[PDB]
Design a protein around this ligand. Structure first.
Ligand SMILES: CC(C)c1nc(CN(C)C(=O)N[C@H](C(=O)N[C@@H](Cc2ccccc2)C[C@H](O)[C@H](Cc2ccccc2)NC(=O)OCc2cncs2)C(C)C)cs1
Ligand SMILES: C[C@H](CCC(=O)NCCC[N+](C)(C)CCCS(=O)(=O)[O-])[C@H]1CC[C@H]2[C@@H]3[C@H](O)C[C@@H]4C[C@H](O)CC[C@]4(C)[C@H]3C[C@H](O)[C@]12C
Ligand SMILES: C[C@H](CCC(=O)NCCC[N+](C)(C)CCCS(=O)(=O)[O-])[C@H]1CC[C@H]2[C@@H]3[C@H](O)C[C@@H]4C[C@H](O)CC[C@]4(C)[C@H]3C[C@H](O)[C@]12C
Ligand SMILES: C[C@H](CCC(=O)NCCC[N+](C)(C)CCCS(=O)(=O)[O-])[C@H]1CC[C@H]2[C@@H]3[C@H](O)C[C@@H]4C[C@H](O)CC[C@]4(C)[C@H]3C[C@H](O)[C@]12C
Ligand SMILES: C[C@H](CCC(=O)NCCC[N+](C)(C)CCCS(=O)(=O)[O-])[C@H]1CC[C@H]2[C@@H]3[C@H](O)C[C@@H]4C[C@H](O)CC[C@]4(C)[C@H]3C[C@H](O)[C@]12C
Ligand SMILES: C[C@H](CCC(=O)NCCC[N+](C)(C)CCCS(=O)(=O)[O-])[C@H]1CC[C@H]2[C@@H]3[C@H](O)C[C@@H]4C[C@H](O)CC[C@]4(C)[C@H]3C[C@H](O)[C@]12C
Ligand SMILES: C[C@H](CCC(=O)NCCC[N+](C)(C)CCCS(=O)(=O)[O-])[C@H]1CC[C@H]2[C@@H]3[C@H](O)C[C@@H]4C[C@H](O)CC[C@]4(C)[C@H]3C[C@H](O)[C@]12C
Ligand SMILES: C[C@H](CCC(=O)NCCC[N+](C)(C)CCCS(=O)(=O)[O-])[C@H]1CC[C@H]2[C@@H]3[C@H](O)C[C@@H]4C[C@H](O)CC[C@]4(C)[C@H]3C[C@H](O)[C@]12C
Length: 329
């Protein structure tokens, strides 16, 4: 009905979070909404670590829909590890509710310093079942199976800093969120939001590259070889000890990413991957790009791509729909 959604709030023009609840008493948590994972976790009142002092914590004893599991789980992300045990309780996203298996986290030491530095309490996975720990049906799929929504799909309309808030819409496509044509790219993986695109950056290209559309990566990642070729004679300087590159914001050597399919063309101009850091010096920007090598040459089209392009994640049609995000409104 209409279209169920959760508001997306920009954090310092580099991350975005949405709020959902756990327990029949609707205990509120702030989440990274992560299309690149397939589990929900919240920090427990039983959490024994420094990071949890600054967070909204889940109290299973205060929920009468809580069902004990206790199966120990370690959740290993590329950027950190959280551990605890499975619990079952009511999960509410927008105005949609369902009983759900999630991880009750008691150790966040492996998630620092990012955890304490950030406003999110946990991570809400929007991936595929066979990627999940504990064989958990994805929230959006379950809601469709329960006839709580018209379609097993969700859309990302990211917030733009000082322009507009964003929305995760569950169960329907709103035309308000995108201008121009919506192009559907079929998945090249059984259990990941990953599509095939030719990647062109200036004179260098990777043919039929694996491209993950990842709401839960706050950067563009490119293969390390590709990045080394991109940055040759570009007048950019890497930060000592850190995989981040600094440039003059006005550096006209900075290239436009061009990603092409049989039916689509997506470009990402420097304004979409530049981060102003003028506290550090005059007219200096960081590139929101990092080198990351997968066994197959892979790009992560993270936050910076999804700031520019509205995205539809369709379980039933096993495709990602891409359209230019509407600027205002
Ligand atoms: C400067 C810039 C780099 C910034 N990053 C941030 C926030 N960070 C740390 C990230 O986004 N980091 C990314 C990340 O790990 N994202 C993660 C969420 C997260 C965020 C913050 C801290 C800890 C975890 C979420 C991403 O979807 C990644 C994508 C991925 C998957 C496999 C292999 C490589 C990459 N997913 C996972 O790591 O999930 C693995 C799984 C575990 N169980 C099932 S799959 C990396 C891919 C770069 C703020 S500013
Ligand atoms: C862009 C955001 C938010 C700024 C804001 O919200 N304004 C800020 C917050 C923390 C900042 C980084 C850290 O400081 C570490 C490091 C220090 C170096 O010196 C310059 C490079 C680097 C990577 C910084 C870049 C950038 O500056 C960041 C990401
Ligand atoms: C989430 C799964 C766990 C096994 C799983 O979910 N299998 C599906 C089948 C489910 N059943 C049918 C059995 C039910 C495990 C198994 C292998 C794991 C990755 C690798 O280690 C490489 C790498 C190490 C880094 O450190 C963290 C990132 C990364 C990408 C890891 C992520 C994640 O941690 C994976 C996918
Ligand atoms: C998971 C990857 C490392 C992948 C890996 O294990 N790579 C081994 C091969 C290395 N090389 C390609 C250089 C060898 C090939 C030689 S070649 O000549 O081919 O280049 C590592 C490398 C740099 C890491 C980030 C930074 O720490 C900054 C920050 C610290 C926070 O706390 C957590 C978040 C964040 C964003 C980190 C996330 C993640 O953790 C990254 C991407
Ligand atoms: C925007 C806020 C605070 C301002 C937080 C949220 C996540 C934080 C980053 C991650 O932690 C990864 C990495 C760890 C290094 O240690 C320092 C550099 C970097 C890039 C962090 C900078 C800064 O702290 C960020 C952007
Ligand atoms: C943004 C800040 C943080 C660290 C700074 C760099 C280091 O200071 C080392 C070195 C000193 C030279 O003087 C000028 C060149 C260089 C590479 C600096 C350039 C720039 O200032 C950086 C990247
Ligand atoms: C980054 C600074 C501006 C500094 C500032 O004050 N901001 C500007 C000022 C003059 C600019 C160059 C020239 O135009 C010639 C040439 C044009 C090509 O098109 C792109 C490459 C190149 C080398 C340009 C690069 C860059 O763009 C420069 C250095
Ligand atoms: C081979 C590497 C893993 C790292 C590696 O180089 N070697 C480890 C071998 C495998 N494990 C030891 C984890 C097996 C555990 C079972 S064991 O029997 O060992 O206990 C490959 C094999 C399959 C890959 C994932 C899947 O494609 C799905 C998905 C595609 C996206 O594009 C990127 C994210 C993700 C989760 C991929 C991550 C990573 O890229 C994997 C684990």
């Amino acid at each position: 009905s209409s279209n169920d959604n959760i508001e997306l709030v920009d954090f310092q023009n580099i991350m975005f979070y949405g709020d959902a609840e756990v327990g029949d008493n609707q205990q509120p948590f702030t989440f990274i909404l992560d299309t690149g994972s397939a589990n929900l976790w919240v920090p427990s009142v039983k959490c024994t670590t420094a990071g949890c002092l600054t967070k909204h914590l889940y109290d299973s004893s205060k929920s009468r829909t809580y069902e004990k599991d206790g199966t120990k789980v370690e959740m290993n992300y590329v950027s950190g590890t959280v551990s605890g045990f499975f619990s079952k309780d009511l999960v509410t996203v927008g105005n949609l509710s369902l009983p759900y298996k999630f991880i009750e986290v008691i150790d966040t030491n492996g998630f620092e310093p990012t955890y304490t530095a950030s406003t999110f309490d946990g991570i809400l996975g929007l991936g595929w079942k066979d990627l999940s720990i504990g064989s958990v049906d994805p929230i959006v799929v379950e809601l469709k199976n329960q006839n709580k929504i018209e379609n097993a799909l969700f859309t990302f309309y990211l917030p733009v800093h000082d322009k507009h808030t964003g929305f995760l819409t569950i169960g329907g496509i709103e035309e308000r969120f995108y201008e121009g044509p919506l192009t559907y790219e079929k998945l090249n993986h059984d259990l990941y939001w990953q599509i095939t695109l030719d990647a062109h950056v200036g004179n260098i290209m990777l043919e039929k590259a694996n491209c993950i559309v990842d709401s839960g990566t706050s950067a563009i990642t490119v293969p390390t070889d590709f990045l080394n070729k991109m940055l040759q004679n570009l007048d950019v300087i890497k930060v000592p000890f850190l995989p981040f590159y600094v440039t003059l914001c006005n550096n006209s050597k900075l290239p436009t990413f061009e990603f092409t399919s049989e039916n689509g063309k997506y470009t990402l101009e420097p304004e979409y991957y530049l981060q102003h850091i003028e506290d550090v010096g005059p007219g200096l920007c960081m590139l929101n790009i990092i080198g990351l090598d997968f066994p197959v040459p892979t790009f992560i089209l993270g936050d910076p791509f999804m700031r520019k392009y509205f995205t539809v994640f369709d379980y039933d049609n096993q495709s990602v729909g891409i359209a230019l995000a509407k600027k205002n409104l």
